[PDB]
mmCIF file of N, CA and C in Angstrom:
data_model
loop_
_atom_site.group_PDB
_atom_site.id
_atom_site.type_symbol
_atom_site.label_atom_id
_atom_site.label_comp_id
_atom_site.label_asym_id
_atom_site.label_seq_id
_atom_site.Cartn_x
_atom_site.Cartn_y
_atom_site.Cartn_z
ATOM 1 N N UNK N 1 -14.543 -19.060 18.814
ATOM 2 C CA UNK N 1 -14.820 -17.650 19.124
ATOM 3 C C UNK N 1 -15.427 -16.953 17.936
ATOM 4 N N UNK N 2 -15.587 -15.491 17.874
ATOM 5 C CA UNK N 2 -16.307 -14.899 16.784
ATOM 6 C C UNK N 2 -15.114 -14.957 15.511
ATOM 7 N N UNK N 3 -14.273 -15.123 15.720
ATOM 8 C CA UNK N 3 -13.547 -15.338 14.668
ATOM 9 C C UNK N 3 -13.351 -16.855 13.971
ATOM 10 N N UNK N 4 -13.821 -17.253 14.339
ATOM 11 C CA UNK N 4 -14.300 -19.043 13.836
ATOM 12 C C UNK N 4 -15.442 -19.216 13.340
ATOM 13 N N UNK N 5 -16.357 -18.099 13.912
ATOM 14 C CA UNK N 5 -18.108 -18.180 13.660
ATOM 15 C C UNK N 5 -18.217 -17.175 12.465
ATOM 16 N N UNK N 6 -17.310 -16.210 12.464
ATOM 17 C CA UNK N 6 -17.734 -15.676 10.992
ATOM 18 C C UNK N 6 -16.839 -15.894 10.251
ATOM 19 N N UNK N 7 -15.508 -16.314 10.111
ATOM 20 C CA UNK N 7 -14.678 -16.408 8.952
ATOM 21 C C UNK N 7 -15.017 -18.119 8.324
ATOM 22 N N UNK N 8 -15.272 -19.227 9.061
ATOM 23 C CA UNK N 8 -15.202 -20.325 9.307
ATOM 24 C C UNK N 8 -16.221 -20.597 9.077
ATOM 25 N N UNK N 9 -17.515 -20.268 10.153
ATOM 26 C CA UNK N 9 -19.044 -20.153 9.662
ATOM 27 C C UNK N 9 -19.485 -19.412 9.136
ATOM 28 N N UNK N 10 -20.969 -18.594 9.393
ATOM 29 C CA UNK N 10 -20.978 -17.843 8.626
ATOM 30 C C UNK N 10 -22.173 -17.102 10.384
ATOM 31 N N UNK N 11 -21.634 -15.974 10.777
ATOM 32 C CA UNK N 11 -22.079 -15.467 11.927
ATOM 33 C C UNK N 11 -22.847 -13.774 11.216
ATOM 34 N N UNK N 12 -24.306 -13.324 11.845
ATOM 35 C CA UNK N 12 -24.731 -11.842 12.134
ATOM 36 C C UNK N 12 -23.694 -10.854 12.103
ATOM 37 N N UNK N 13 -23.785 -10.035 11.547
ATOM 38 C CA UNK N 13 -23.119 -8.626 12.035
ATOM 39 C C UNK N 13 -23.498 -8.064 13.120
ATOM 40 N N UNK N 14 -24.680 -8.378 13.570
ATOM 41 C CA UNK N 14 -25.153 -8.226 15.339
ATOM 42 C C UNK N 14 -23.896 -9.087 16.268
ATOM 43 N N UNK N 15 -23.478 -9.427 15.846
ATOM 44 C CA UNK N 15 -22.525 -10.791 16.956
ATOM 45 C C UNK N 15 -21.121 -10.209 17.049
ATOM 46 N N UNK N 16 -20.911 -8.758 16.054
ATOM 47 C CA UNK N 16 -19.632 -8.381 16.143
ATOM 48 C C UNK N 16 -19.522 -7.383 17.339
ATOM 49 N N UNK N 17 -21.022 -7.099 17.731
ATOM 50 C CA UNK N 17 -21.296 -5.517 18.658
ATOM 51 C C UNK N 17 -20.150 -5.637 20.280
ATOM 52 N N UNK N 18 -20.736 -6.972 20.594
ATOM 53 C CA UNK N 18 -19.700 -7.967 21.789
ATOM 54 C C UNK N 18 -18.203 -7.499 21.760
ATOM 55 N N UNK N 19 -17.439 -7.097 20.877
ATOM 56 C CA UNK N 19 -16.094 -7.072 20.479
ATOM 57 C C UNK N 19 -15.755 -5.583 20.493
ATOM 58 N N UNK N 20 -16.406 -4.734 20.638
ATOM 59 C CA UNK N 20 -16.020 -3.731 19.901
ATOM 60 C C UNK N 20 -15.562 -3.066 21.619
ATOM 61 N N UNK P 1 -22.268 -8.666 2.042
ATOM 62 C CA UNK P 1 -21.573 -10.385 3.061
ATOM 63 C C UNK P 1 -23.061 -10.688 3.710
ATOM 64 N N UNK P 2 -24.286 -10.657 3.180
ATOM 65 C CA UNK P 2 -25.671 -10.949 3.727
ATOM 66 C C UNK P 2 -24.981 -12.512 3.788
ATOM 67 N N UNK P 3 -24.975 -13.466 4.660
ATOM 68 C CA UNK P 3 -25.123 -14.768 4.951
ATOM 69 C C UNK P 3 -23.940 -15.114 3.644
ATOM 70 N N UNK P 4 -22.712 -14.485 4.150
ATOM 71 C CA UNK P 4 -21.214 -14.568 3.400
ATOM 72 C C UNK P 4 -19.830 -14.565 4.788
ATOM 73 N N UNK P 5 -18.672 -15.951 4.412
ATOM 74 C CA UNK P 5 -18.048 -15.138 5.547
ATOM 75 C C UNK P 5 -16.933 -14.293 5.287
ATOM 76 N N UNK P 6 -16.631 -14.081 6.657
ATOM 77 C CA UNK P 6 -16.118 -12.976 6.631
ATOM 78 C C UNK P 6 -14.890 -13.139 7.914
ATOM 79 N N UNK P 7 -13.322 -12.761 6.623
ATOM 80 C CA UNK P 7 -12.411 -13.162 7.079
ATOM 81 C C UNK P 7 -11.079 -12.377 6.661
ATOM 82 N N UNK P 8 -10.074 -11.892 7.722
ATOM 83 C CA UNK P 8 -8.876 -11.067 7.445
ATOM 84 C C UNK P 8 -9.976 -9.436 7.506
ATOM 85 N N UNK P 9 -9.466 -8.650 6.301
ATOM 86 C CA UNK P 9 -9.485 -7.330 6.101
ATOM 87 C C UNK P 9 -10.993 -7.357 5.435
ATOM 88 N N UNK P 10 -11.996 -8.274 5.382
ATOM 89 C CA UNK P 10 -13.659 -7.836 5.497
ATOM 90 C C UNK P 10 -14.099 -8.046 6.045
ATOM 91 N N UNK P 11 -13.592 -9.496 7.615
ATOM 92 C CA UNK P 11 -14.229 -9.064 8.651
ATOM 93 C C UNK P 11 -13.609 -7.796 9.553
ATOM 94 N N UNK P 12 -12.767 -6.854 9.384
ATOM 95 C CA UNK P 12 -11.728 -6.063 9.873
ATOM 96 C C UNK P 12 -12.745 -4.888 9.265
ATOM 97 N N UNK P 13 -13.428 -4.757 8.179
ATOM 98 C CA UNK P 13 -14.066 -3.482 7.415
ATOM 99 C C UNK P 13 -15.797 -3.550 8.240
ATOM 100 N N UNK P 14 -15.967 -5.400 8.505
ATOM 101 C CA UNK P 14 -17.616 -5.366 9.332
ATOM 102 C C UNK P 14 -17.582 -4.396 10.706
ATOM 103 N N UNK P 15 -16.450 -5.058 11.430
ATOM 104 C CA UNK P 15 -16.665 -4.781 12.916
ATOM 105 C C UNK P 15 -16.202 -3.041 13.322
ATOM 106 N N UNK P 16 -15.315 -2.497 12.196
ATOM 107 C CA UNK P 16 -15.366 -0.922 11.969
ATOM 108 C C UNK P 16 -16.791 -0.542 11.850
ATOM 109 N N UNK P 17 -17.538 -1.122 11.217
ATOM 110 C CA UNK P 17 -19.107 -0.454 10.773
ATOM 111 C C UNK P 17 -19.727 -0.475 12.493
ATOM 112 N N UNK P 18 -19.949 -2.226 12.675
ATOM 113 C CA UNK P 18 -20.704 -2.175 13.634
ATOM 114 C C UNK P 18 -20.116 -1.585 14.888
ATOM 115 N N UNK P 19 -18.721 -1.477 14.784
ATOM 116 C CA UNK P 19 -18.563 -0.927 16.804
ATOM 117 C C UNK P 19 -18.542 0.782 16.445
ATOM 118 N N UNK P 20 -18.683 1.638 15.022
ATOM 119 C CA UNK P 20 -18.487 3.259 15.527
ATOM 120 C C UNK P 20 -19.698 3.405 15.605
ATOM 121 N N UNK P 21 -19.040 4.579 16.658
ATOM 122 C CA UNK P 21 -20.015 5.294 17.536
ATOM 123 C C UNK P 21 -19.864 6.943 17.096
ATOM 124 N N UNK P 22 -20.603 7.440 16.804
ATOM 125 C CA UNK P 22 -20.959 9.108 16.589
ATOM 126 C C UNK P 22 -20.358 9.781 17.682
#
């Protein structure tokens, strides 16, 4: 999930918009 | 964090930026 893709990988700050 | 990750309380400070709304 986005929490695997940016802490783990390295994910956009565009990819956080989904969550909010 | 340009192509840095981001984890606990700085991905917690990103997704404050990107989800406010005016």
């Amino acid at each position: 999930g986005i929490v695997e893709q940016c802490c783990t990988s390295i994910c956009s700050l565009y990819q956080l918009e989904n969550y909010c | 964090f340009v192509n840095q990750h981001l984890c606990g309380s700085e991905l917690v400070e990103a997704l404050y930026l990107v989800c406010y709304e005016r």
